[PDB]
Design an enzyme around this catalytic site. Structure first.
Site, PDB file in Angstrom:
ATOM      1  N   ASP A  25      -0.454  -7.362   2.148  1.00  0.00           N
ATOM      2  CA  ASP A  25       0.071  -5.953   1.751  1.00  0.00           C
ATOM      3  C   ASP A  25       1.951  -6.029   2.159  1.00  0.00           C
ATOM      4  O   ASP A  25       2.265  -5.815   2.959  1.00  0.00           O
ATOM      5  CB  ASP A  25      -0.530  -5.105   3.166  1.00  0.00           C
ATOM      6  CG  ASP A  25      -0.123  -3.675   2.984  1.00  0.00           C
ATOM      7  OD1 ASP A  25       0.258  -3.332   1.853  1.00  0.00           O
ATOM      8  OD2 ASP A  25      -0.372  -2.853   3.799  1.00  0.00           O
ATOM      9  N   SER A  84       4.529   3.571   8.269  1.00  0.00           N
ATOM     10  CA  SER A  84       3.631   2.543   7.403  1.00  0.00           C
ATOM     11  C   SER A  84       4.661   1.917   6.475  1.00  0.00           C
ATOM     12  O   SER A  84       5.804   2.437   5.856  1.00  0.00           O
ATOM     13  CB  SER A  84       3.051   3.602   6.371  1.00  0.00           C
ATOM     14  OG  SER A  84       1.948   2.773   5.761  1.00  0.00           O
ATOM     15  N   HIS A 106       0.677  -1.432   0.053  1.00  0.00           N
ATOM     16  CA  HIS A 106       0.095  -0.153  -0.106  1.00  0.00           C
ATOM     17  C   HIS A 106       0.869   1.357  -0.008  1.00  0.00           C
ATOM     18  O   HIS A 106       0.293   2.463   0.054  1.00  0.00           O
ATOM     19  CB  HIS A 106      -0.951  -0.011   1.182  1.00  0.00           C
ATOM     20  CG  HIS A 106      -0.333   0.292   2.297  1.00  0.00           C
ATOM     21  ND1 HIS A 106      -0.029  -0.677   3.331  1.00  0.00           N
ATOM     22  CD2 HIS A 106       0.309   1.592   3.001  1.00  0.00           C
ATOM     23  CE1 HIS A 106       0.608  -0.065   4.380  1.00  0.00           C
ATOM     24  NE2 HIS A 106       0.619   1.074   4.207  1.00  0.00           N
TER      25      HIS A 106
END
Ligand SMILES: *[C@@H]1O[C@H](CO)[C@@H](O)[C@H](O)[C@H]1NC(C)=O
Length: 388
Positions: free
Chosen positions: A232, A334, A176
């Site tokens: 992911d 992230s 992502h």
């Protein structure tokens, strides 16, 4: 009913991948002329174009697909739910000629393990949470996390994500970070750069940090942002191998056995970053690299903490919130690393990639992390495809 052994005993007729790609026949053109260098298990029967797991791939059954020679995807079977959470002895899984160097020595930090010095909070990882005092996130020590990688947007220059160094040449992050249509994110190799060896977010670190271009990005073939960031995961190749130092060194990757041993012995894993996850959410703030140790959450507690279906490829970490105590949801960068230290071989291993559950608008209990333990055969096939 569920399919056992990651589909190694499977004898059905499923012949499309998770993403609708028709399987190629196992005997086919580039399935016999550019797909025999790989060592298969004969007990598995490579029938017509049916998904099969002939190479002990922890991810499961797969098949060759149209595209470049050796292209493949995984198929959708209802695997049995697997609770993975149940000198220096290490041996190398990957070909150094495609992986690059670094595997034999992975997870041994020049400034700590190699000098028989312990970092300030590593003992905390093997200790039960006595209730009582928590050691909060603080500034990392120099050299504490030499596998830390920053992913930048080239223009305008902007920190996008964390990532992790697994060799001199390969880096792991969340899919992502590169591809996320809800936020209009579609980065190609030339949109990005990475910096390695960094401690400060805002100060140029003369003689220490390293910048690099990306030659290639491989989004995981199972990646599906539609269903709670399924797989992911992304692997990125450096255009120029990075030179190792006191500040730059790769982390180890675990198989299923090693993952089990890490979770059986440890209470906590470790999250390092510049609080980028919290920041990018607010876009779509510490100047120095942070380090926090977080307890692994029991699977039923993780399942009960959220509205979404938590698969066996995902796990929670953090302290349970109470009337006087907030949790550690949306910690880290992230796509950044969640690591654990093996008390058995003294080495650091990445155990997860920072992801999210429902995301930072409704994740308030624990943080979510994607397991890396299934990735080795995928990484192997990807690096052998790319070549030297
Ligand atoms: C992103 O744009 C690229 C152009 O670099 C295009 O090939 C592709 O369709 C886009 N990627 C995805 C996953 O849609």
């Amino acid at each position: 009913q569920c399919v056992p052994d990651r589909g190694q005993q499977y004898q059905g007729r499923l012949a499309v991948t998770t993403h609708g790609l028709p399987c190629l026949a196992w005997a086919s053109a580039q399935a016999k002329a550019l797909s025999k260098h790989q060592d298969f298990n004969s007990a598995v029967q490579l029938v017509e174009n049916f998904c099969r797991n002939p190479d002990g791939d922890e991810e499961g059954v797969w098949c060759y697909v149209a595209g470049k020679p050796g292209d493949f995807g995984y198929c959708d079977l209802n695997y049995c739910e697997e609770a993975v959470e149940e000198t220096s002895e290490y041996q190398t899984f990957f070909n150094p000629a495609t992986f690059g160097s670094g595997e034999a020595d992975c997870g041994l930090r020049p400034l700590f393990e190699k000098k028989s010095l312990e970092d300030k909070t590593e003992r905390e990882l093997l200790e039960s949470y006595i209730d009582g005092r928590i050691v909060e996130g603080s500034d990392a020590e120099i050299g504490m996390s030499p596998w830390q990688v920053m992913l930048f947007r080239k223009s305008p220059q902007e920190l996008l994500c964390g990532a992790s160094l697994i060799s001199d040449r390969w880096v792991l992050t969340a899919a992502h970070c590169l591809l996320y249509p809800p936020w209009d994110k579609n980065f190609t190799e030339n949109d990005l750069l990475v910096r390695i060896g960094k401690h400060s977010r805002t100060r140029y670190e003369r003689n220490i940090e390293k910048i690099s271009m990306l030659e290639k990005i491989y989004i995981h073939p199972r990646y599906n942002w539609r269903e709670n960031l399924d797989r992911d995961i992304a692997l990125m190749k450096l255009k120029k191998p990075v030179a190792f130092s006191d500040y730059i060194h790769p982390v180890c990757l675990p198989d299923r056995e090693t993952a089990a041993s890490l979770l059986q012995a440890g209470y906590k894993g470790r999250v390092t970053g510049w609080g980028n996850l919290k920041e990018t959410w607010t876009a779509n703030q510490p100047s120095v690299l942070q380090v926090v140790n977080l307890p692994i959450v029991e699977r039923p507690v993780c399942k009960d903490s959220t509205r979404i279906r938590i698969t066996d490829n995902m796990f929670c970490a953090g302290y349970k919130p109470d009337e006087g105590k907030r949790g550690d949801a949306c910690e880290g960068d992230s796509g950044g690393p969640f690591v654990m230290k093996s008390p058995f071989n003294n080495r650091w291993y990445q155990m997860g990639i920072v992801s999210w559950g429902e995301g930072c608008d409704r994740d308030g209990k624990y943080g979510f992390y994607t397991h890396v333990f299934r990735l080795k055969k995928w990484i192997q096939k990807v690096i052998d495809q790319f070549g030297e």
